[PDB]
Amino acid sequence: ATSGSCKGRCFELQEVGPPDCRCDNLCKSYSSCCHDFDELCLKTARGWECTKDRCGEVRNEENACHCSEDCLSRGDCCTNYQVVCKGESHWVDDDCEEIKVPECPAGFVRPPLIIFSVDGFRASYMKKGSKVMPNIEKLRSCGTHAPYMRPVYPTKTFPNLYTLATGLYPESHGIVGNSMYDPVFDASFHLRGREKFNHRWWGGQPLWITATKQGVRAGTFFWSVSIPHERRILTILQWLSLPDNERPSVYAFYSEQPDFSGHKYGPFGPEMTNPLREIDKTVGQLMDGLKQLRLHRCVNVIFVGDHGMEDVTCDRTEFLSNYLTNVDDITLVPGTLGRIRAKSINNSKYDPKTIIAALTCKKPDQHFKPYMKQHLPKRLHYANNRRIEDIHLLVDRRWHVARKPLDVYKKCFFQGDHGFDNKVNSMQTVFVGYGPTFKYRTKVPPFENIELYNVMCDLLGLKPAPNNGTHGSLNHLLRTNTFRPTMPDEVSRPNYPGIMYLQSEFDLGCTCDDNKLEELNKRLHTKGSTKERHLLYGRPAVLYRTSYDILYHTDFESGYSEIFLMPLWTSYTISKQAEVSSIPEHLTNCVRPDVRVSPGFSQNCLAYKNDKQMSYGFLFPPYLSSSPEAKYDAFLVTNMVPMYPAFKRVWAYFQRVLVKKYASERNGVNVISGPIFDYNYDGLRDTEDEIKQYVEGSSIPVPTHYYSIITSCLDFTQPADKCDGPLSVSSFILPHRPDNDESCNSSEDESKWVEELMKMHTARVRDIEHLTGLDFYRKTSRSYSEILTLKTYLHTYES
Numbered sequence: 101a102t103s104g105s106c107k108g109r110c111f112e113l114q115e116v117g118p119p120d121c122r123c124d125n126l127c128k129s130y131s132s133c134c135h136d137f138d139e140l141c142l143k144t145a146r147g148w149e150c151t152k153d154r155c156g157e158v159r160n161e162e163n164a165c166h167c168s169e170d171c172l173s174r175g176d177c178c179t180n181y182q183v184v185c186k187g188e189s190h191w192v193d194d195d196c197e198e199i200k201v202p203e204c205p206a207g208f209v210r211p212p213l214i215i216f217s218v219d220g221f222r223a224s225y226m227k228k229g230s231k232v233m234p235n236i237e238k239l240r241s242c243g244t245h246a247p248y249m250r251p252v253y254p255t256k257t258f259p260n261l262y263t264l265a266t267g268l269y270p271e272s273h274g275i276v277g278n279s280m281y282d283p284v285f286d287a288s289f290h291l292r293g294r295e296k297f298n299h300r301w302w303g304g305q306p307l308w309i310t311a312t313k314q315g316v317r318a319g320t321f322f323w324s325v326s327i328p329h330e331r332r333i334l335t336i337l338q339w340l341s342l343p344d345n346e347r348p349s350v351y352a353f354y355s356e357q358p359d360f361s362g363h364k365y366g367p368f369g370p371e372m373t374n375p376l377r378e379i380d381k382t383v384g385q386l387m388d389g390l391k392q393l394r395l396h397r398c399v400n401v402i403f404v405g406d407h408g409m410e411d412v413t414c415d416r417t418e419f420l421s422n423y424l425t426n427v428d429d430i431t432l433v434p435g436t437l438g439r440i441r442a443k444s445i446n447n448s449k450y451d452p453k454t455i456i457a458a459l460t461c462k463k464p465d466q467h468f469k470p471y472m473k474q475h476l477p478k479r480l481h482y483a484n485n486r487r488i489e490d491i492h493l494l495v496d497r498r499w500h501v502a503r504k505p506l507d508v509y510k511k512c513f514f515q516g517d518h519g520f521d522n523k524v525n526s527m528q529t530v531f532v533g534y535g536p537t538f539k540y541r542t543k544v545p546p547f548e549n550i551e552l553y554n555v556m557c558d559l560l561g562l563k564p565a566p567n568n569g570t571h572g573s574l575n576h577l578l579r580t581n582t583f584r585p586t587m588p589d590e591v592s593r594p595n596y597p598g599i600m601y602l603q604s605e606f607d608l609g610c611t612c613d614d615n616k617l618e619e620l621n622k623r624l625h626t627k628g629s630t631k632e633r634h635l636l637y638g639r640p641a642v643l644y645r646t647s648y649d650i651l652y653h654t655d656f657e658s659g660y661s662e663i664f665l666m667p668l669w670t671s672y673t674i675s676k677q678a679e680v681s682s683i684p685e686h687l688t689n690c691v692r693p694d695v696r697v698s699p700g701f702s703q704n705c706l707a708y709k710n711d712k713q714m715s716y717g718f719l720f721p722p723y724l725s726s727s728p729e730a731k732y733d734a735f736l737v738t739n740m741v742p743m744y745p746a747f748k749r750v751w752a753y754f755q756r757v758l759v760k761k762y763a764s765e766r767n768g769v770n771v772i773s774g775p776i777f778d779y780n781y782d783g784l785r786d787t788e789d790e791i792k793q794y795v796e797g798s799s800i801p802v803p804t805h806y807y808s809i810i811t812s813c814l815d816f817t818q819p820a821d822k823c824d825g826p827l828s829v830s831s832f833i834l835p836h837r838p839d840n841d842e843s844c845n846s847s848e849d850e851s852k853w854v855e856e857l858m859k860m861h862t863a864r865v866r867d868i869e870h871l872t873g874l875d876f877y878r879k880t881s882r883s884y885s886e887i888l889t890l891k892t893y894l895h896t897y898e899s
């Protein structure tokens with residue numbers, strides 16, 4: 101009903117209620133603007149730059165921007181007004197000067213935040229395009245920057261922008277791809293069209309809502325595509341001239357480039373120089389505009405991308421028609437990832453298991469790998485949403501997957517794409533922060549985009565809604581406004597059992613072929629005399645209510661769950677000089693009752709004998725015993741965990757070969773290993789009534805995963821157990837699977853496939869914290885913020 105008018109309402113901030121016509125920055129997208137929106141609000145006359153002959157002109161209100169004497173007071177000068185007409189310098193030509201305090205106009209309650217978001221801005225553009233992006237390069241060198249910023253999976257636009265806005269993984273915010281089916285709604289979300297505007301898709305609490313709820317006004321973050329960039333910038337700078345009571349504190353600009361061109365020309369096509377130059381010019385406009393308004397040393401600016409861009413061509417497409425015979429009974433969400441479901445919910449013939457097998461290791465150079473979503477690397481956090489199909493295809497970088505060839509030529513064109521695994525170098529993107537609240541000329545380590553919501557809340561004095569960041573892990577980016585977290589309180593205190601049971605009280609079906617000077621010696625070990633060696637960073641805290649026992653040994657310390665009948669964690673340190681030994685022949689099947697732990701809170705060997713699918717392994721490896729006599733400790737029933745034979749191939753190679761490899765490379769390592777139970781694939785520790793599988797005929801729960809956290813000195817001239825400074829960590833969460841079908845080369849020796857498996861399942865300490873309810877690194881000499889940064893680190897193994 102578009103017969104109202106935008107007179108006095110151009111880019112109004114509160115969207116008004118239909119059937120009233122709209123004048124906001126989204127009205128175009130809803131085909132809902134007032135009849136006169138173009139005429140009044142999208143003025144273009146005379147373009148975007150003052151020229152010497154316009155200087156001091158008489159205001160003509162038709163003009164796109166103004167060069168008249170009254171423009172600064174009206175807040176609508178062209179951004180280069182002061183340069184052309186008042187002998188000022190462009191911002192980019194001024195020397196960098198530390199911004200120690202906000203230098204703001206009277207009436208500003210807080211430094212505004214401007215988020216300058218760029219689509220497809222691959223991390224290596226900062227170096228490779230540096231000659232053509234002077235404004236961006238100045239932000240980067242003068243402010244705070246990371247070498248790259250890791251997006252979320254899938255590395256698609258809307259998932260990543262909405263993660264930037266919420267601090268949530270896609271599985272939690274609900275935007276799990278650029279297209280989606282929700283079976284509860286029975287509704288589909290797509291790029292073209294109108295279902296995507298329905299608020300039911302968009303979960304969590306984005307920043308603009310966080311701000312508004314806490315009394316901080318926000319600019320609208322979404323811009324209709326036909327609003328030119330120059331007008332987006334002028335609109336931000338006009339909002340910044342509003343009266344104090346009406347002026348927002350937070351704003352966003354969005355550019356469709358360089359992604360748009362990247363799809364057509366590839367990430368480094370010669371056609372890509374011009375898009376980068378144009379984005380740089382836009383930054384130049386904003387910064388000159390801010391300088392004219394005396395806000396260039398007041399506003400915090402974030403320059404951030406959503407994802408990178410890889411080389412991808414029509415010829416590098418895998419077709420499911422080459423694998424499946426039944427291709428017409430499936431629906432594929434295709435491209436740089438695959439999602440499969442049945443075409444019809446009425447077809448009771450459809451079998452996921454037979455689709456997975458038809459897609460598993462079928463061609464020698466196969467460029468995708470099928471997964472049930474719960475088997476995807478836990479670092480992707482891509483499973484706990486009904487909109488994510490059970491069957492997933494992880495597509496190799498530089499490829500696509502499509503159902504049938506006709507899907508590719510009845511739709512070559514494109515040379516770039518994105519969406520792959522968020523660890524891929526080509527998918528990484530950019531972060532720069534510049535302003536009074538950011539540090540000066542500071543480089544920070546790469547970090548994940550899920551962290552930025554909390555920092556944007558810190559920048560605006562807002563309490564963040566509950567999110568997937570680790571608040572405090574990015575304190576090192578900030579001069580002021582840091583968030584001073586406290587360590588979580590321990591909820592369950594351990595028991596410290598002594599010798600309480602005689603050997604003959606145990607009837608576990610286990611067998612094992614097993615001085616005065618050093619009778620004293622081993623009592624001291626059982627009491628915790630080596631614990632300083634093996635537990636370097638304090639006991640992990642247990643953050644839920646449970647019953648557990650600390651068990652000390654010569655070579656390792658454990659926290660043993662009376663509820664799960666196995667350790668929650670097992671801690672041990674392996675020096676650079678440590679020797680690997682074998683399991684002696686007489687000890688191959690040895691399992692020994694632990695006289696500190698009741699038969700009733702023990703595992704039993706008969707269950708493993710009866711369970712024809714399930715075997716067992718050990719958390720502290722017998723191979724790394726300090727002596728023949730200490731080795732007996734490794735065969736305690738309290739160090740045993742359930743393991744599928746297929747998984748024991750992986751585990752044994754880790755423990756026999758890789759631990760000592762790491763200790764020799766890193767100058768000792770401290771290892772914490774344990775089980776994980778996540779049968780509902782939510783990324784969070786299961787309660788015991790959530791466990792779906794037990795060792796047959798027993799109450800021994802079967803883990804879904806095994807973790808290890810491997811810590812050493814960042815200065816590897818110091819040994820792990822005498823480190824004065826910062827730490828270095830790598831971690832994994834390995835799937836506990838009954839086959840090695842994930843690894844196509846598993847018939848080969850473990851030296852050819854195990855380590856590549858472990859790399860794929862690399863993890864953050866924080867990932868393990870969520871999955872176990874444990875809190876690590878409780879007793880170090882480091883600041884808590886530094887430890888939080890360490891807990892968020894991911895070792896990615898990219899070149």
Ligand SMILES: *[C@@H]1O[C@H](CO)[C@@H](O[C@@H]2O[C@H](CO)[C@@H](O[C@@H]3O[C@H](CO[C@H]4O[C@H](CO)[C@@H](O)[C@H](O[C@H]5O[C@H](CO)[C@@H](O)[C@H](O)[C@@H]5O[C@H]5O[C@H](CO)[C@@H](O)[C@H](O)[C@@H]5O)[C@@H]4O)[C@@H](O)[C@H](O[C@H]4O[C@H](CO)[C@@H](O)[C@H](O)[C@@H]4O[C@H]4O[C@H](CO)[C@@H](O)[C@H](O)[C@@H]4O)[C@@H]3O)[C@H](O)[C@H]2NC(C)=O)[C@H](O)[C@H]1NC(C)=O
Pocket residue numbers: 268269271272273274300301302303304481484485486566567568782783784870
């Ligand atoms: C990443 O960070 C996020 C945010 O912190 C973490 O997610 C949170 O985790 C909590 C635990 O899983 C969860 O808390 C539960 O929420 C229920 C209330 O939920 C609504 O209200 C909130 C608040 O405004 C809202 O955010 C929710 O939004 C979700 O759902 C809507 C759809 O309505 C989506 O638009 C939105 O995208 C979001 O979806 C995501 O989360 C849901 C779960 O809520 C998933 O199903 C989706 O797939 C998607 O991932 C909701 O609108 C509350 O009812 C729960 O309490 C029950 O559960 C326990 C038992 O387990 C029990 O103590 C209670 O008594 C109660 O039990 C009864 O209900 C049971 C379940 O129905 C029933 O079976 C029993 O028999 C009982 O009757 C619970 O507190 C919180 O909602 C989410 N939040 C978000 C935004 O996702 C996430 O864990 C972090 N990830 C990692 C790895 O750390």
Ligand SMILES: O=C(COCCc1cnn[nH]1)N1Cc2cnc(NC3Cc4ccccc4C3)nc2C1
Pocket residue numbers: 215217219257258261262264265278291321322323324352353354359
């Ligand atoms: O059309 C899309 C996306 O299309 C996907 C298609 C595609 C294919 N390959 N690549 N992309 N748009 C239009 C649009 C408008 N305005 C914003 N504003 C942003 C600014 C900002 C800053 C922080 C957090 C959130 C936001 C939202 N974002 C967008 C994204």
Ligand SMILES: [Ca+2]
Pocket residue numbers: 219220256257258359406407
């Ligand atoms: Ca994008």
Ligand SMILES: [Ca+2]
Pocket residue numbers: 777778779780781782783784785786
């Ligand atoms: Ca769980």
Ligand SMILES: [K+]
Pocket residue numbers: 707708709710711712713714715
């Ligand atoms: K068995």
Ligand code: NA
Pocket residue numbers: 840841842843844845846847
């Ligand atoms: Na295999």
Ligand SMILES: [Zn+2]
Pocket residue numbers: 220257359360363518
């Ligand atoms: Zn794109």
